[PDB]
Ligand binder design. Structure first.
Ligand code: NI
Ligand code: NI
Length: 370
């Protein structure tokens, strides 16, 4: 069972856990309670296993989409932030931690893809997807290319596909309608066709993956790429002069990237729910708290309005939030895995020539709503 009298926190090893610990030291000073921060391997898989037996950490940190399954099994406590506290965070982040109408976690950070460009090759990045073909025809003339990004995963290609109307699951009144899927509608078809045409016209290659795109951009071979905050440090070392900005529009509409929200959940079995709330709300979710975590390992954009406004002085972070507000929160239902596999296959088949855009999307649609 979970020990009372202390707080045990689990967070991924790729996060600023040393920073969380510093926030833990300030909490300990005022309450006399010690905070332990651990980062187990395969945390997302271990938590549900131990929490099921009434054990595990008092607090679990992980992107939100995984919390829907946890809440389904009753592994998370409903949090109780009052109106005042809720207004301190961006409205859309609360939607990311909602399941069956209940708030089951505290939003911490906001992740989303942005357009990254080489300022030396492209002082003024394109505002639309449509102008990319001609831009590439200009650059290839100089031995360069306009754009290169990972085409293997839906995470990177769905922003364009969704722009004109595609969607995973219809969301209304805080709930996804698993039978209302927007994969083979007119909008998704327009987006995927534009993507496939880029490949057919030799502006992109169907085989381009993460490593390839990153290397090409970091070597100054391509004017643009699409990636998240996790990729910035590698570009910093490459010395390429770059900027991060809003994703291009399609047919005048916003590219919609999926939005991931680093969230903090409270174990339903924890006898320390009062200590966890206090720590999360009044120590971590403060300018001083997020700053501590962010200085250890960058969080990217954050859900706390006050601190986000400060972090947004960095255009890269402002861009991240802008794309996030224009995107769609990653659904936290189990059917999302079906969408990801189905759409991953559809894009690969259309990009290769195995299937036409219309047939590829029709198959995925039917596969998802099965
Ligand atoms: Ni570890
Ligand atoms: Ni995940």
């Amino acid at each position: 069972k979970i020990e009372e009298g202390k707080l045990v926190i689990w967070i991924n090893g790729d996060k600023g856990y040393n920073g969380l610990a510093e926030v833990g030291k300030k909490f300990e000073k005022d309450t006399g309670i010690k905070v332990t921060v651990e980062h187990p391997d395969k945390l997302e898989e271990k938590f549900p296993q131990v929490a099921a037996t009434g054990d595990g950490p008092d607090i679990i940190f992980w992107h939100h989409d995984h919390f829907g399954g946890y809440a389904q099994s009753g592994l998370l406590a409903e949090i109780t932030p009052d109106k005042a506290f809720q207004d301190k965070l961006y409205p859309f982040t609360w939607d990311a931690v909602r399941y069956n109408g209940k708030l089951i976690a505290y939003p911490i950070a906001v992740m989303a893809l942005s357009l990254i460009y080489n300022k030396d090759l492209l002082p003024n990045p394109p505002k639309t997807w449509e102008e990319i073909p001609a831009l590439d025809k200009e650059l290839k003339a100089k031995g360069k290319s306009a754009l290169m990004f990972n085409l293997q995963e839906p995470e990177f290609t769905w922003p364009l596909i969704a722009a004109d109307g595609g969607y995973a699951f219809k969301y209304e009144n805080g709930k996804y309608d698993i039978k209302d899927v927007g994969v083979d509608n007119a909008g998704a078809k327009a987006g995927l066709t534009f993507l496939v045409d880029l490949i057919k016209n030799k502006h992109m290659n169907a085989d381009t993956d993460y490593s390839i795109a990153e290397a090409a951009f970091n070597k100054g071979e391509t004017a643009m790429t699409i990636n998240g905050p996790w990729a910035w440090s590698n570009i910093d070392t490459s010395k390429v002069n770059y900027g991060v900005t809003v994703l291009p529009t399609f047919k005048g509409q916003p590219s919609k990237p999926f939005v991931g929200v680093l969230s903090a959940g409270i174990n339903a079995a924890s006898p320390n729910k009062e200590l966890a709330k206090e720590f999360l709300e009044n120590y971590l979710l403060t300018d001083e708290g997020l700053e501590a975590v962010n200085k250890d390992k960058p969080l990217g954009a954050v859900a706390l309005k006050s601190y986000e406004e400060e972090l947004a002085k960095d255009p890269r972070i402002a861009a991240t939030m802008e794309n996030a507000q224009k995107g769609e929160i990653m659904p936290n239902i189990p059917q999302m895995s079906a969408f990801e596999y189905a759409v991953r296959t559809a894009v690969i088949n259309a990009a290769s020539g195995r299937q036409t855009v219309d047939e590829a999307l029709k198959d995925a649609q039917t596969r998802i709503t099965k």
